[PDB]
Amino acid sequence: FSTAEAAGVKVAAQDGQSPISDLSVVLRGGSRYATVPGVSHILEKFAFQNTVPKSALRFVRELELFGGKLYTHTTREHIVLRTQFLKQDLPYFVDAFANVLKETKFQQFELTERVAPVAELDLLKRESDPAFTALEAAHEVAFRTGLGNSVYAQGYSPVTLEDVKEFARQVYAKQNVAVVGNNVVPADLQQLVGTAFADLQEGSKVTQAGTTTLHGGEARVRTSTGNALTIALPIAEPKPVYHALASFLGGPASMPWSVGASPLAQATVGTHTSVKATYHNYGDAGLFAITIKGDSPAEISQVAHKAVQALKDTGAEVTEEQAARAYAKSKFAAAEAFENPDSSASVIGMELLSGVSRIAPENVQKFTPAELSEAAAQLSASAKPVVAAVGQVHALPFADEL
Amino acid sequence: MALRKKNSLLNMANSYVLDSPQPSNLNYFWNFGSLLALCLVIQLATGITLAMHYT
Amino acid sequence: VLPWSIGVIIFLLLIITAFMGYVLVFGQMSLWGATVICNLVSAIPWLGEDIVHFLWGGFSVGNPTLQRFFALHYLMPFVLAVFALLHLIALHTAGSSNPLGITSNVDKLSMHPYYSFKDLITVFAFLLMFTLFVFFSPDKLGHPDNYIPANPMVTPASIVPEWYLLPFYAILRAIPDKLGGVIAMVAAILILLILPIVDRSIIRGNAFKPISKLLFGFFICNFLLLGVLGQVHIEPPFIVLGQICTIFYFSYFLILLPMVSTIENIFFYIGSL
Amino acid sequence: ASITSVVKTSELILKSPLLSKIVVPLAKTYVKFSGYRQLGFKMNDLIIEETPNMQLALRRLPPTESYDRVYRLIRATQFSLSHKLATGNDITKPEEDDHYLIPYILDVEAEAFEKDALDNLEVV
Amino acid sequence: ASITSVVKTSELILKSPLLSKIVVPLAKTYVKFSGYRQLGFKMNDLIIEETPNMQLALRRLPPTESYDRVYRLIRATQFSLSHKLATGNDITKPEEDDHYLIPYILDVEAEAFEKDALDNLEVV
Amino acid sequence: VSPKTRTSNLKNGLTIASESNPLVQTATVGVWIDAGSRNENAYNNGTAHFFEHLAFKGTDKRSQHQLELDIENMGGHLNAYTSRESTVYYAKSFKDDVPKSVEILADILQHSKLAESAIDREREVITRELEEVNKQYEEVVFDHLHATAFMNQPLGRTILGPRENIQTITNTELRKFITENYTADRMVLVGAGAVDHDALVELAEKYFSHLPSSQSPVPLGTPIPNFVGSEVRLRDDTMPVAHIAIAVEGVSWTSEDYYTALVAQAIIGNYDRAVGTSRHQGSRLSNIVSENNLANSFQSFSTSYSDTGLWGIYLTSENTTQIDDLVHFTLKEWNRLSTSVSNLQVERAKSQLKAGLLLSLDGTTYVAEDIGRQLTTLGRRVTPAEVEAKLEAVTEHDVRAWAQKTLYDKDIALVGLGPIEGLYDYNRIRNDMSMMRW
Amino acid sequence: GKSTYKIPDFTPYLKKDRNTDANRLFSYFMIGSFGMLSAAGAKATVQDFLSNMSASADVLA
Ligand code: HEM
Ligand code: HEM
Ligand SMILES: CCCCCCCCCCCCO[C@@H]1O[C@H](CO)[C@@H](O[C@H]2O[C@H](CO)[C@@H](O)[C@H](O)[C@H]2O)[C@H](O)[C@H]1O
Ligand SMILES: CCCCCCCCCCCCO[C@@H]1O[C@H](CO)[C@@H](O[C@H]2O[C@H](CO)[C@@H](O)[C@H](O)[C@H]2O)[C@H](O)[C@H]1O
């Protein structure tokens, strides 16, 4: 991805040999910057609504004539708007993004009839998985605001058209926008972005209201629709070793009809439960989480004890074999993330919008057993453990039990 | 929505002769109602015609 | 649109019902009116003469025609009652319109007791008019010739329909061609079916439309003049006047109402800016 | 006729200096003789509403505009049944006769007409 | 007649040795000739249900009994329209002909009849 | 323009097919087999699915645990699936972990233990799978759809097989199945992503050279199905959403009408209320359904097999009093493929498909799946230029002629699950397959 | 008796040539014949019946 600048907008593109191009606008407008709760989700859903040059209807009908597709999502850090189309149709897609950023008519009827109902279905579909809920609850306990803001719009706190219009005035500005083109000729994209995004406001860098503060605690989301438990440990100094540790501890199987050879995978034997360790770097803080879902609260409780033990055991001693297995699983995870268009866009988006250079999968550091055990030791001896229980919460563990 | 259901006049006919939900096991003795309707239509047609010629 | 369209058919059935009932007396106007009105069917190309003989049940209006008119005159009011019920059921989906032309969904009253008691006033006003004709002047609306028994030999001085059919008769006389005249006469009723299309107004009804109100006034008075011209003799200058009134009748639907309703739309918009 | 049609034709007239010079005074007199203001209506309260497009435009009115329209319809209905006219502040003054509904119906119709056009596109 | 009446009279008969000796054998043949078991029905499936009391009793059936009753009605309807009889395990055996509904309807009616009595009480 | 798919053979008749992408760092290698449940009879139905479980249960060298560790150490993962006509076993890895992954796949396919103890253990796991598919409503619907459309025929059988067979599957019949079916002339070794073709051919010569050849080598993708118009109703009033599939007999992979059927399917298209753009789609059915809230979703499909196919639509709806309208409007849109479609709809669908068929292939696994599927169904990978030409050859006359012989007034197979009281009987549904006005 | 994927036996009823044009055409020949006799019967009925309104024998005499 050759990083450049076109009329004040950061543009990164990588040419390829495929008939299919992916163009993504990455906006510094994720939930950690959300002025009011849910606004970044609403702004994402307001993309490709009516603009002054082109109605939402006309856009969708023309997109079907190109056979293009449209993908949008919100993270804690970004809003990502992606289009996938044939290489030759690049100018149309550049101009479409320009119309969205410069000329979106934010109309109240679109909010009530189109945008908010779709936002609500989006969230309900995600929450069908209790593990999603548990990991969201864990971020809320751990960070409170900023990273602790909800990613998604919720019913209890309504977003108004004035909220969304204000946020869009901040976000849709040259300072918060990066263009990422997969299988796009980089010289051609710079020329097109330079003509199309020239009249976009310059604006200012959107910032997180307040510094990231870490907290421990418990969240007990009582649902009737499945059971899950996250054990998170907030990290004040994000370090790349936690990727290796997440992959080492593992949890999912690498093979059909198997349990797996990972410590967390072996913690589920004799139970219909699954487990997944994840590490979330957010630049200035991080979160190391272990999420366990299952149908039995008794089994979840059982696995949760084994999970905390596994982390303590790791803090004691890692073998050389295990450390190499962690390097291999981690390099692989990095590679597939840089391939997947959704995650790819945000990775280069971070490099362009902040200045955090991407770590290429081939350059993923090999951590010695000493370095891994040290990282696990810090987590087992955390002052601020978070536990989010979802489901039959009366039957799930508490932080002080773990 | 289908016109037969949407339009109030059509929907009245629909409710009696088309979508009308019937038991699946009516035997042939449930056919006398339609024969009575047939007799009534024959009597109206023949009766009005005889009225054109009768004094 | 649907209650109005079924309404137009109710009006046609009332005309047929009343025409057949008038023949039943079998006085001079009964016979000669049946003869001339039934001979209009002879204009239907190719089969017209055959259809007339078939309707009469013979070669002129006679006993077979009278007996069949009795049977049909008895039947037609029952058919008319069914169509009257159909147009009410069709109306029930929107409810009654009202004189302001706006929705009444904001402010409804039960039919009873309010409109029950308001209907009694006009029932008694109607019964007073009924009483004055039926008891004090029972033959004012009739033709003396219908007290002479039908005589196929002697033709009455003037053969005219009952007063309520007179405007349609004037329209028919206006066209010199037989078939032309019959088409025009039928079209004068069926053209009511196009009002939903030719009225281009964004507003329902005339309460707030001064130009439409003037046009409506002229249309109604022209309809009454056509009625009068239906019973004058075919003489100057009434021949030409009947043709001008016929043109005005049709031009209301085809030209004037579409033009006036278009212009009034623009005056409401510009006038209230 | 569509509101779109009425609005476009009116704009053609308002552009032409000659045309506006002769049409605008007539339209103002027409409105005065129409007399809907004497029942406390605004012009847009009279537009036929029993149509999918108009029902959608009315649903998009802001709540305040919607509640006030309901009151003007009820008040006009009460003047109509009483055979009275508005007096005083119930009479709509010319400056209060605002086109509150026109922008909503023009947006509803814009989409409706674009949908009709696009249903008839032919790939070239 | 009410189920309560039928049940009480039946109990009077079953008490009397003489009466039961002559009535019970008759009732068993009656049921055999009735032939509802040959369509896979249980006796209680035949009771008229279009009454408030019976609709309430049916709503109080346990879900499994309710689902099985639905199946027996559908199955019997299919035998009826085909002009066939049950065979094999579809025939209701005498030991399967259980009064699953009688306790529910007797409770519904007990309350209904107590309510009628108490609506007519006279303070003494 | 995507890189050329290279293809080589070994002596036994194993095909190697590869498509390199020097921009990615991962690779998907695997074995596509032209064999699946359809190759079983009634007695061993379920064997192919049973084998897929045992393939990961230990080989002559590596035990179950060693297998787990070996893959964990590789860093990527292994995956498998068995369908009615196709079995796949693949490994996603790093660029330089490809020789490990080929070696593990070759081991689990050729040298699996199928130990009586493991057969007995899985026999319970698979028995539990019978009572948990019940939740995956789309799969329940499509399995009943095949069962009824191809009543009492091999395509009509499920992949899991009956409970009775699961209890009686022996290591003998497992071994017999994979010896008869997993032959070199029915197998394709596929690599996509960061793979060298010449490297992959060497690895094939090293690991898959001692594969049996079949006695009578037919070409890849070689097969008579007799469709039954019929219905399965699985009414469940406690479910909130109705799931309905309606299908007619469709087209095989090698039909001359294969592209015509895809274009017709694209004219009806898909719809999902949860996606923002779906209210603005061009499809007539989409407009009717969205305006009237008739459904949560619908998905048109055109499934192909070697000698038949099913073409139809899958609907989901909460609108339980308007299921009749939903079905009525859907079948009236099908009628219009016979009576009304013109160059307007046809050219629009062709535009959308020309991109769609390329867009689908957006990762190494999708590319590998495309090479593997095409090689095992057609015997070759069809270049995008050829695909563009075949799509361009579809005219409106072709669509109307196809719909008139395939849809118009034809029997349907219909499956309804959930609150489907409002779904009318077979005749009233099948009467919507024609229009009396035409 | 338990599996819903095992379709009940329909072999006593199923026709082997059920998907053929000849199969459909036969059933439409029955429907068509019925429609044809109903058309011919309606025509005869209407013509004979309505002829009552044409001049009776005593009128033609
Ligand atoms: C339920 C409907 C009807 C029934 C049961 C019925 C019954 C009868 C009967 C029993 C007769 C004596 C027939 C004879 O022996 O000659 C008769 C005669 C007659 N009916 Fe009806 N009728 C009915 C409807 C009508 C209608 C609607 C008319 C319309 C006028 C009508 C007109 C006549 C006439 C004119 C005669 C005398 C001529 C004759 O005997 O045939 N009938 N009717
Ligand atoms: C037997 C003759 C008729 C009867 C008994 C009849 C009766 C009625 C009644 C009771 C109503 C509701 C109350 C009212 O508005 O006055 C009504 C409404 C109506 N009628 Fe008629 N009607 C007849 C003929 C006609 C004709 C000939 C037409 C049209 C040409 C017609 C068109 C309508 C319409 C459009 C309405 C709805 C008017 C509205 O409320 O805005 N009717 N009719
Ligand atoms: C028999 C000849 C055919 C002509 C029809 C007979 C005329 C009698 C019709 C007028 C009586 C009113 O008839 C009444 O109409 C409504 C809708 O039409 C029916 O209503 C029924 O169907 C509609 C949809 O089909 C549903 O909204 C409703 O839930 C259901 O109850 C009533 O069950 C019926 O009693
Ligand atoms: C909307 C429908 C269209 C209009 C309906 C037409 C109404 C009248 C049509 C013809 C009626 C008379 O037409 C005539 O019918 C009678 C049968 O009834 C036929 O007469 C034939 O059969 C009758 C008895 O069945 C014999 O007595 C006669 O000798 C023989 O010729 C004539 O051959 C035919 O010329």
Could you walk me through the main structural features you see in this protein, from its secondary elements to its overall organization?
Chain A has 402 residues and is an alpha+beta fold. Chain A has twelve helices and eleven strands. Chain A folds into two domains: 2-197, Cytochrome Bc1 Complex, Chain A, domain 1; 217-401, Cytochrome Bc1 Complex, Chain A, domain 1, CATH 3.30.830.10. Chain A is globular. Chain F has 438 residues and is an alpha+beta fold. Chain F has a domain at 6-208: Cytochrome Bc1 Complex, Chain A, domain 1. Chain F is built from 16 helices and twelve strands. Chain F has a six-stranded mixed sheet, with helices on both faces. In chain F, strands 7-12-8-11-10-9 form a six-stranded mixed sheet, sandwiched between helices. In chain F, strand 10 and strand 11 form a beta hairpin. The relative contact order of chain F is 0.16. Chain G is mostly helical. Chain G has helices at residues 21-50, 57-60. Classes of the chains: A alpha+beta (402), B mainly alpha (55), D mainly alpha (124), F alpha+beta (438), G mainly alpha (61). Chains in contact: A-D, A-F, B-C, B-E, B-F, B-G, C-D, C-G, D-F, F-G. The interface between A and F is large, with 57 and 56 residues. Residues 5, 11-17, 19 of chain B line the site of one dodecyl-beta-D-maltoside.
Short description:
The structure is cut from a larger assembly and holds one copy of chain A (402 residues), two copies of chain B, two copies of chain D (124 residues), one copy of chain F (438 residues) and one copy of chain G (61 residues). With 438 residues, chain F is an alpha+beta fold.
List keywords for this structure.
part of a larger assembly, 7 chains, A: 402 residues, alpha+beta, Cytochrome Bc1 Complex, Chain A, domain 1, 2 domains, five-stranded mixed β-sheet, 11 strands, 19% strand, globular, B: 55 residues, mainly alpha, 3 helices, flat, binds protoporphyrin IX containing FE, binds dodecyl-beta-D-maltoside, membrane protein
Structural class of chain B: mainly alpha
Helix content of chain B: 55-70%
Beta fraction of chain F: 15-25%
CATH architecture of the domain at 6-208 in chain F: 2-Layer Sandwich
How do the helices and strands line up, and which of them pair or pack?
This is part of a larger assembly, with one copy of chain A (402 residues), two copies of chain B, two copies of chain D (124 residues), one copy of chain F (438 residues) and one copy of chain G (61 residues).
Chain A (H helix, E strand, L loop, with lengths): L1 E5 L2 E6 L5 E8 L11 H7 L10 H11 L2 E6 L4 E8 L3 H14 L4 H20 L2 H14 L17 H11 L5 E6 L3 H11 L20 E5 L5 E9 L5 H9 L23 E9 L4 E9 L2 H20 L3 H20 L1 H13 L15 H12 L5 E5 L12
Parallel strand pairs in A: 2-6, 7-11
Antiparallel strand pairs in A: 1-2, 3-5, 3-6, 4-5, 8-10, 8-11, 9-10
Chain B lengths: L2 H4 L1 H10 L14 H20 L4
Chain G lengths: L20 H30 L6 H4 L1
Bound molecules: protoporphyrin IX containing FE (2 copies) and dodecyl-beta-D-maltoside (LMT) (2 copies).
